[PDB]
Curated annotation (Swiss-Prot), chain A:
Belongs to the universal ribosomal protein uL11 family. Keywords: Chloroplast, Methylation, Plastid, Ribonucleoprotein, Ribosomal protein, RNA-binding, rRNA-binding, Transit peptide. The modification N6,N6,N6-trimethyllysine is found at residue 33. This is Large ribosomal subunit protein uL11c. Its main location: plastid. The chain holds residues 79 to 211 of 224 of the full protein. It comes from the Eukaryota.
From Swiss-Prot, chain D:
The keyword Cell wall biogenesis/degradation does not apply. The lineage of its organism: Eukaryota, Viridiplantae, Streptophyta, Embryophyta, Tracheophyta. One of its GO terms (biological process) is negative regulation of translation. The keyword Phosphoprotein does not apply. GO terms for molecular function: mRNA binding; structural constituent of ribosome. Belongs to the universal ribosomal protein uL13 family. It comes from the Eukaryota. This is Large ribosomal subunit protein uL13c. The chain holds residues 126 to 250 of 250 of the full protein. One of its GO terms (cellular component) is cytosolic large ribosomal subunit. Component of the chloroplast large ribosomal subunit (LSU). Mature 70S chloroplast ribosomes of higher plants consist of a small (30S) and a large (50S) subunit. The 30S small subunit contains 1 molecule of ribosomal RNA (16S rRNA) and 24 different proteins. The 50S large subunit contains 3 rRNA molecules (23S, 5S and 4.5S rRNA) and 33 different proteins. It comes from Spinacia oleracea (Spinach).
Curated annotation (Swiss-Prot), chain F:
Component of the chloroplast ribosome (chloro-ribosome), a dedicated translation machinery responsible for the synthesis of chloroplast genome-encoded proteins, including proteins of the transcription and translation machinery and components of the photosynthetic apparatus. Its main location: plastid. It comes from Spinacia oleracea (Spinach). This is Large ribosomal subunit protein uL10c. It is found in: Plastid, Chloroplast. Transmembrane segments: none annotated. Component of the chloroplast large ribosomal subunit (LSU). Mature 70S chloroplast ribosomes of higher plants consist of a small (30S) and a large (50S) subunit. The 30S small subunit contains 1 molecule of ribosomal RNA (16S rRNA) and 24 different proteins. The 50S large subunit contains 3 rRNA molecules (23S, 5S and 4.5S rRNA) and 33 different proteins.
UniProtKB/Swiss-Prot annotation, chain G:
It comes from the Eukaryota. Component of the chloroplast large ribosomal subunit (LSU). Mature 70S chloroplast ribosomes of higher plants consist of a small (30S) and a large (50S) subunit. The 30S small subunit contains 1 molecule of ribosomal RNA (16S rRNA) and 24 different proteins. The 50S large subunit contains 3 rRNA molecules (23S, 5S and 4.5S rRNA) and 33 different proteins. It comes from Spinacia oleracea (Spinach). Belongs to the universal ribosomal protein uL6 family. Disulfide bonds: none annotated. The keyword Metal-binding does not apply. GO terms for molecular function: rRNA binding; structural constituent of ribosome. One of its GO terms (cellular component) is ribonucleoprotein complex. The keyword Ribosomal protein applies. One of its GO terms (biological process) is translation. This is Large ribosomal subunit protein uL6c. Component of the chloroplast ribosome (chloro-ribosome), a dedicated translation machinery responsible for the synthesis of chloroplast genome-encoded proteins, including proteins of the transcription and translation machinery and components of the photosynthetic apparatus. The chain holds residues 39 to 216 of 220 of the full protein.
Length: 133, 37, 135, 125, 11, 137, 178
RNA sequence: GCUCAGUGAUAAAGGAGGUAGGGGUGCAGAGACAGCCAGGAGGUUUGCCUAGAAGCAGCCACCCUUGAAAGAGUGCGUAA
RNA sequence: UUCACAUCGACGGGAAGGUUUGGCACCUCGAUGUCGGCUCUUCGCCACCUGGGGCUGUAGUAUGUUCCAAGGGUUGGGCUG
């Protein structure tokens, strides 16, 4: 059981991933192409991924939330977030981008409604300095 | 063990006891051991 | 270091320290304050140190009033000086405080940070003191 | 509290015939001198010192070392303090006969028991 | 030591 | 702690959720994750109401609504189910399957109450076999 | 009077013979005999239901502390003669070993000499040559004692955890040499 | 009534579950303290910085959500 | 390195001692006299070494600091009133 952060449709570079989870006995090409196929099924985004491994070297992995900070960095059109959140505001997103970032991240949250997901994403955007209305 | 006139608990785990009349401080970690005097 | 800018005569009477000070009793500026319990003589250096200590330990908390000040001169004769041939040279300056007198006033903090800061202040004081809250 | 009573009787202060300048007093035989009781931490604290007469000639015993070694000295030394000092004092002190055991070889003298009017003299555990 | 003793009639 | 006012309004909210519902389901939980608590709270609040309460808080709310025959179900830890909207078998059926996945996860079924009557740990099997409103009507 | 310890009565199980004379208590259990004397204030009551409830003559702070202590004491001599007490200590290191032979416990702790330890009657010491040692005895005080005397010779050092330790121990481990 | 220090002979700031009182203020019988069983989540690996900073080197923000409760984290720990 | 309290500890405060340099003039003036060595003691503990320990930024050796401890020890020379 190990936690890594990988890019959307790119896998198996030598320094970031392969040695790290490959020293625990995990197959590199199966995890990398199953993860690229699962990020080809959903909208492609940078994915933190938790890969669970077992005694027989088989592995099952869960793709976590594509970062709400990266999704709200591409929704407000910016690159770098605000160095001082709630002091300097670096962009603005509409409520429809709230419901969109909370629909793409909805299978990956624990929220029981779309309004809870929308206020979670409005809380993360209130946290990195990005205004929302 | 430090020995001094003023002994205070220096963290949360510290305990001030009374041994044969003198006030001591026992703790988990050895650096926080003190004796009054 | 606090000190008067001018006086006519240099040298002065020891005086005598009695009673309560009824005037400095109130806390009129800030919120929390340090009250002098006992009849003593505060050098300017001590007030300086106490203020500095309270200021540094408070930091992010706002305001410190110094309600006293060393306006009475004090004189000393050198070492190996036989007694006679005049009163000595004023070295330093003191403020006379009597019980009930307020020393430090402090505002802009929670009561906890204030209790701690006032403690570290009262550590550089020659006298026993007290912690009081505004009415 | 006992040694006071003892001193009174040795000195003679309980006879109408008392005189400071004379011995009108009794003899007193103290028995079971290791069973004598003492309050507080005194057993480990009270300190019997005696001095050689050379410098650094001081010797100290705790009460208990003493009571294990030669326990009669304790009561002899506690009564001698309350007798007068000087000629009649010392000559008096010879009337105090102390034994560590429960037994005394004076049965010929027909000893009576000593009256104690003190309340607190008897300790109980 | 900055304190004195009591000599004679003081004492 | 909890003031007497908040506990009187809590027993009143539990009694108002008691008057509208046709069935009670008692469940005790010890040593379980919050994740399956929130999955059980993905499945439950839709068709039914789940309320976790103290022994006496359940005692004085159920005695008055005439559910009193369920008093032995309040010994030990207490979590309750009332059916406000949906039927009895659609609420009782998921709980026993969730108790078969919870065998190592520490769940046990104490008892249920339907028709004003008390059914034990095994007698709720019937309450599970009952069909949906489309098949009965 | 209000010590949460002295209120709880002690259960004397069958196999346990309780002989009470005045303030002196002699208990003869399956494993043997234990004797204790009570101080002035503590009065322990032998019930008709077969229980021991501790009461106190007067309440000084003295007697309060007393009765708490003695209720636990004589609960431990009862449960002591019934079942018994086992202290277990294991040894950590290279060459460290123990051998029970006759009346001695021989310890090789890395000293020059073999360390010999005279084992008291009341104690029975079982040894695992797998470097574990258990001592069993009817009296908590004496077993605890001897256990400590074992541990004394080479107390656990901070770095590599080496030395004699009790079965369950938190040992501060510093990183030496970094 | 008090003291257990042989204090009862002398000295201060400071320290203190010493001890015997007195006064406010908290909670509780829908059970308070201590113990013991479980939970301690989602955003998120907050933003900045940094080879890395993931509650826990440093800086700034310190909100929101699911909630019985859970700090953008009190301490330990990892190169992270 | 992180970490006030391993070790230091600025600005200030509270003391003990009576060994330094002093203030006083109670003391003795007739022949009650200062600093070093020799010989000869003796006592204090604020411990330099030797005995036992706690902490360490103690791996080991060696330290550092501190606790109890004054039983014993504490060289020979060139140089100075
Ligand atoms: Mg007056
Ligand atoms: Mg005036
Ligand atoms: Mg002061
Ligand atoms: Mg003096
Ligand atoms: Mg005294
Ligand atoms: Mg300090
Ligand atoms: Mg004269
Ligand atoms: Mg002469
Ligand atoms: Mg010393
Ligand atoms: Mg040494
Ligand atoms: Mg050492
Ligand atoms: Mg080293
Ligand atoms: Mg010595
Ligand atoms: Mg000597
Ligand atoms: Mg010497
Ligand atoms: Mg020399
Ligand atoms: Zn501590």
């Amino acid at each position: 059981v190990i936690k890594l952060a990988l890019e959307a449709g790119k896998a198996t570079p030598a320094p970031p991933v392969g040695p790290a989870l490959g020293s625990k006995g995990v197959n590199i090409m199966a995890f990398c192409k199953d993860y690229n196929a699962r990020t080809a099924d959903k909208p492609g985004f940078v994915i933190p991924v938790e890969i669970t491994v077992f005694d027989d070297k088989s592995f099952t992995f869960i793709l976590k939330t594509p970062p709400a900070s990266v999704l709200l960095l591409k929704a407000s059109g910016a690159e770098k977030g605000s160095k001082d959140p709630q002091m300097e505001k670096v962009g603005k997103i509409t409520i429809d981008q709230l419901r969109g970032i909370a629909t793409e991240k909805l299978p990956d949250l624990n929220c029981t409604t779309i309004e809870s997901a929308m206020r979670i994403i409005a809380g993360t955007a209130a946290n990195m300095g990005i205004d929302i209305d | 063990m430090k020995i001094r006139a003023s002994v205070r608990p220096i963290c949360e785990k510290c305990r001030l006891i009374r041994r044969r009349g003198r006030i001591i401080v026992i703790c988990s970690n050895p650096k926080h051991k003190q004796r009054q005097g | 270091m606090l000190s008067p800018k001018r006086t006519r005569f240099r040298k002065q009477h020891r005086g005598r320290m009695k009673g309560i000070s009824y005037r400095g009793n109130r806390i009129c500026f800030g919120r929390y304050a340090l009250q002098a319990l006992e009849p003593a003589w505060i050098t300017s250096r001590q007030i300086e140190a106490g203020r500095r200590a309270m200021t540094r330990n408070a930091r992010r908390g706002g305001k410190i009033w110094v309600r006293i000040f060393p306006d009475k001169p004090v004189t000393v004769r050198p070492a190996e000086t036989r007694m006679g041939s005049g009163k000595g040279s004023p070295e330093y300056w003191v403020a006379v405080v009597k019980p009930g007198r307020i020393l430090y006033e402090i505002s802009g903090v929670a009561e906890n940070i204030a209790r701690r800061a006032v403690a570290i202040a009262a550590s550089k004081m020659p006298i026993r003191t007290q912690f009081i809250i505004s009415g | 509290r006992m040694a006071s009573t003892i001193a009174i009787h040795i000195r003679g202060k309980n006879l109408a015939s008392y005189t400071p300048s004379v011995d009108m007093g009794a003899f007193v035989i103290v028995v079971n001198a290791d069973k004598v009781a003492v309050s507080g931490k005194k057993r480990t604290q009270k300190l019997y010192r005696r001095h050689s007469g050379r410098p650094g000639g001081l010797k100290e015993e705790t009460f208990d070392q003493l009571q294990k070694r030669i326990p009669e000295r304790i009561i002899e030394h506690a009564v001698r303090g309350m007798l007068p000092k000087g000629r009649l004092g010392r000559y008096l002190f010879n009337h105090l006969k102390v034994y560590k055991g429960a037994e005394h070889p004076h049965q010929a003298q027909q000893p009576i028991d000593l009256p104690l009017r003190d309340k607190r003299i008897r300790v109980e555990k | 030591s900055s304190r004195p003793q009591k000599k004679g009639t003081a004492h | 702690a909890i003031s007497r006012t908040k506990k009187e309004e809590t027993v009143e909210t539990v009694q108002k959720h008691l008057e509208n519902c046709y069935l009670l389901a008692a469940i005790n939980y010890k040593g379980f994750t919050v994740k399956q608590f929130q999955d059980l709270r993905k499945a439950l609040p839709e068709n039914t109401t789940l309320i976790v309460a103290k022994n006496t808080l359940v005692e004085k709310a159920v005695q008055d609504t005439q559910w009193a025959a369920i008093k032995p179900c309040m010994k030990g830890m207490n979590a309750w189910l009332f059916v406000h909207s949906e039927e009895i078998p659609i609420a009782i059926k998921p709980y026993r399957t969730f108790q078969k996945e919870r065998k190592l996860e520490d769940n046990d079924f104490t008892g249920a109450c339907f028709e004003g009557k008390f059914y034990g740990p095994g007698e709720v099997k019937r309450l599970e076999t009952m069909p949906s409103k489309a098949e009965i009507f | 009077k209000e010590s949460r310890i002295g209120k709880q009565p002690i259960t004397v199980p069958a196999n346990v013979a309780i002989a009470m004379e005045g303030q002196d208590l002699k208990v003869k259990g399956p494993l043997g005999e234990l004797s204790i004397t009570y101080p002035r204030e503590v009065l322990v009551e032998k019930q008709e239901s077969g229980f021991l409830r501790v009461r106190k003559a007067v309440e000084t702070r003295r007697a309060n502390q007393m009765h708490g202590l003695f209720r636990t004491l004589t609960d431990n001599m009862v449960v002591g003669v019934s079942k018994g007490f086992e202290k277990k200590l294991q040894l950590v290191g290279v060459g460290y070993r123990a051998t029970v032979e006759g009346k001695d416990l021989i310890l090789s702790l890395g000293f020059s000499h073999p360390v010999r330890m005279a084992i008291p009657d009341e104690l029975q010491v079982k040894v695992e040559e797998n470097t574990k040692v258990t001592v069993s005895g009817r009296d908590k005080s004496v077993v605890g004692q001897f256990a400590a005397t074992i541990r004394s010779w080479r107390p656990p050092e901070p770095y590599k955890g080496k030395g004699v330790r009790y079965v369950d121990e938190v040992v501060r481990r510093k990183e030496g040499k970094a």
